Symmetry: D2
Subunit: 327 residues, 4 copies
Amino acid sequence: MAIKIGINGFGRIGRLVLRVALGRKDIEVVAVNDPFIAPDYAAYMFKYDSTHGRYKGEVTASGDDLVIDGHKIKVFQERDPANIPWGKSGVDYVIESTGVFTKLEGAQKHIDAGAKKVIITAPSADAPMFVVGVNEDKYTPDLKIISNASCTTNCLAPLAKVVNDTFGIEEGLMTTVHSITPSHKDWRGGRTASGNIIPSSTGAAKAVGKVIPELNGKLTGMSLRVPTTDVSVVDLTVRLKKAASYEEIAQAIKKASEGPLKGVLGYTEDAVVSTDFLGSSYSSIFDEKAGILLSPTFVKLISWYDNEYGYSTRVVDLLEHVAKASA
Amino acid sequence: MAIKIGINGFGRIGRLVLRVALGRKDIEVVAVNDPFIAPDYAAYMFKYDSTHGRYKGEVTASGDDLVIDGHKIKVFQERDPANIPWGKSGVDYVIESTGVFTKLEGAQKHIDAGAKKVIITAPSADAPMFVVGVNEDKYTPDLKIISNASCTTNCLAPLAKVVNDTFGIEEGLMTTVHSITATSHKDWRGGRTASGNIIPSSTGAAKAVGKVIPELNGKLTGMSLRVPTTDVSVVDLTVRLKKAASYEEIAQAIKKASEGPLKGVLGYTEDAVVSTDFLGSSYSSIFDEKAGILLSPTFVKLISWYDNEYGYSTRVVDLLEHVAKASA
Amino acid sequence: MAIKIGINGFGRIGRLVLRVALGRKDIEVVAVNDPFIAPDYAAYMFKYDSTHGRYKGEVTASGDDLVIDGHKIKVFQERDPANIPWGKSGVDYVIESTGVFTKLEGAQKHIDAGAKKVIITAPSADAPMFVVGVNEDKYTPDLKIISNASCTTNCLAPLAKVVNDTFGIEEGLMTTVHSISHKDWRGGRTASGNIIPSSTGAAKAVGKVIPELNGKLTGMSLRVPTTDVSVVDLTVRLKKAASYEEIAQAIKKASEGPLKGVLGYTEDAVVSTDFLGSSYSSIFDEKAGILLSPTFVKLISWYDNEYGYSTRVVDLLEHVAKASA
Amino acid sequence: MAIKIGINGFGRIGRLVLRVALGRKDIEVVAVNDPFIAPDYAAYMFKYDSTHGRYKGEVTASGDDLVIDGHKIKVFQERDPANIPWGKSGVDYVIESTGVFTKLEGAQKHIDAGAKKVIITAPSADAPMFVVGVNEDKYTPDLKIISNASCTTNCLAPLAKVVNDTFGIEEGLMTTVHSISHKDWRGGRTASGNIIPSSTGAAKAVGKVIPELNGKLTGMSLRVPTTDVSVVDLTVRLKKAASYEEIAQAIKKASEGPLKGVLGYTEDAVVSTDFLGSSYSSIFDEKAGILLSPTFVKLISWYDNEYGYSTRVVDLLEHVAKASA
């Protein structure tokens, strides 16, 4: 065997990872660390704000433990990760879902405190990134601290993985219309999101060059925040090396959707809207009808994704691959 | 001495055109035709349904007329454009904002009803299209029915002009994020709830630019992403250039044209702006300089804002005055 | 044994009833009728707009059938309800969900076409109205054409019953905030970014479902741009004095007894989306209510628009069949 | 004659009161205090003033000052309100628009820094409370720290005054539809796509500005995903019997004389965004209110959140600083 894991931080990603981890039989959530929230408040946010609607099952809160469908889960309140008793409770893998310890120096504190491997759920500035379905086969057991990139990257990287392997991506620009999911001169972010299209920035397109090195330096992108929530979409516009018709691009994306990228890269040919993909375990759903082709080497591809939901499943997928590779 | 005009249809487009024509001294409105609405219902839609703030002015509805700041507007409920008396009212120009008679077969019903030239405020595969700032100079007086394209086309064409005139447009894939505008199985996605939903849809705006810019014919196609917002939309143009350049050369070319040939039509800004920052703007296209990306010296993505039909409606009044000046 | 039903109109309510009916074994949906949509279009709206998000099941369409998880359902396209082959299809009950044949004369056309009884999923101006949990026991088998009231009425009537039964309602004003050329000029305004005050006879219709409250209950509506989750705000003057604890404790007792599955009771810091896909007809919000005097209180109750209402339609359908035979 | 003021905090309320302050001819803004923001960042937020449109004036940021229409306004970044050079800058009145220094022990630091009087733009548990048009004439110059309550209170108090003066309010329950140790858990939820019930406490605040209604009004709030304008739903029990026409006529006559400017009256089919930018404190919706009994009515009134409130702050400032009004 049972993979004894632990989760630092109990936010949107931390709660979504816990729900998926509780559904896996070979994974045992031993403890959770969050110094800000109380055990009863953690049960409230997991009851109503884990998945859409509310969780279906008994969720209680003991004096210092979360009881979710009988599974007693210890809760710690340590603001410094080096004080979390990962060793005493027997936690091997720590899912870093705080967004503040996203570098090797910070994530190492979990390893110093009794843990072995640390998987952070955010783009890192020094830890090797890994995207399930794209470069998880490149993982080797010597990597103690890795990363699973962000929301958009887990949607763009599989789509770009298929188009690059079949036709070759010469260069590509991306615009991701992002849902609600002043830190460094970000004046546009301080504006109210309600009733506002806010052009922001993301490093997802460049981070793709890190999970598939062939595309390094070949992709840039920006974001357009919209007042809606739940589901975001990726608008990839690339120049191809090999000419093609749209029918050949969609059938290549579909061929991988049913084979190697099963469960990660979805495919559809229906008149779908954003709310059709809420609660989807997919990381990227290609919209065949939405895409348009202007020349046999210049096409625009569109892919949906439900923010942190399908992403949080890939964290659990990556956790099992890293634990399996250490056998 | 005054352009005696008239508006067929009192919708969101027609009410904004009536609002701009009053400010212009050379344009006088005398009649408004709308079958399904009443004069008192029209005074309510002009005062309040103008989704900005509120029309700061007295808006009264007489027995059969519309009083706005002391100006009488004869309201007609003719369901057929072949029965609205344009000649008895002396309205030489007709603004077709119904969106139903967007062809020469229907627009001619305004001509043989006493009026001279009628301009349709919607794309027309039957009538020649025109965009103020691009192909507006190629207007000829013998042409009696012209089209002012759509609000999206009036945003892409001014931008795609200065980019093609300076660097030359090779290809161009467009994405227009559109907010709530205005309205049978030709659009399944359209029959979905707009609230809390991202709805992709097609648009012929990029293909329409190929008509107002004959060089770009066949090099610009696009699609739309409807979002639940209100009066503000944006254009995400990804173009391959014919000549290598830097981003500051592209921004300086747009900034230069915004200060000269496209003054008032094409806007330029370098501020960290959001959508609501352009509420009620008279520009039809406003370039966002800080938002653009240059991946390679021939591969760029440009961003331009536009306030839906408001910047489009004031453009109809500009093209209308051009027809009067061209009537030699 | 297994009741054979049919659905008129394939809109939001007709789709939600078909979904709940498929989940129950005692009901067998034989056919649907909608003269405006094609079979492939009815399958599209059922796949991506019946269940919130996406339906968990295969939804295809053949020539004149709507195959949903293997079960074939005939599809008619009759504008006149009297031309619908209900008799030869074996359908005994018709679910009138179009919203235009909501009177006795109009709904009769289903009976003229071979059906036995019709249930209108809308308030009716002449057909008898019944709400599950309030006056469902007042139904007699001789009633052929009944109404299931509104979705708002199905939220106010359960709450108003327990408050009137335990403490008695002297008077009561309510206000429901409803989530997403004409006679009313506010309805023509854009719903995006607007709180539009509208109106409904939901409170006056409570008098038809509990005759005591007839004439001493009225309210209005405030439309909000939210998505398919509304909440009723009821302000009543009580006849018997009480504390807020005693009002909430009684609502809880009925939620765990006679009104189980219909009236819900919560004490948590819940929000709109917490009742997404909720099977209840109304959920009392204990923390939201406030008491001013011992006989003057304000109560809050949520409901997921037409979801719990459609489950209630299926509930009323099985009760009528329970009483018809 | 001329008064010199300063604004502590540069949030939405602080930015709105600054705009109305520049419009008047008597008040001259001297300096603004904000430790988190910068002078260059302050010009960016004031030029794009949230949901009110772009400012029609040259708003540039100089070296250490902020320039609007040529007027140079100093900017201080002192985190402590006692270390702000209000006296060295010649500031007399401090507009506490922060929300943290609402008590007397906190607001009096501005007095120790060189100012003479402080007006808090938030309901205070220690400072006396005033609402223009309701109890502004009861201000005595010996009061150096006062508050103008909340923007919700400025919508109910002028309405409750007119109803109570003519018909008398026995009891009143309120519900306001709001737009935009853990205490409130609902507040920590996503505002978009959610109706979030909250507690405003504005009705009990009317007991301070109207001592007669003390203990007769309590309310709650419903936060909806919108902006611009909010609404107030008042359900009062009257003392004297009256019809809805008598109530509407009493409000209309009040809004044309003693409350000309603060209270508004409309009979049109209005919506939310129709009051975007209204300087009124309350707009009675005559076409929306209903009457169940001659002494049991439900009144609805609109208010444009912080806009009219901020205008009402400058009215209180000139009323306090000058005896002419």
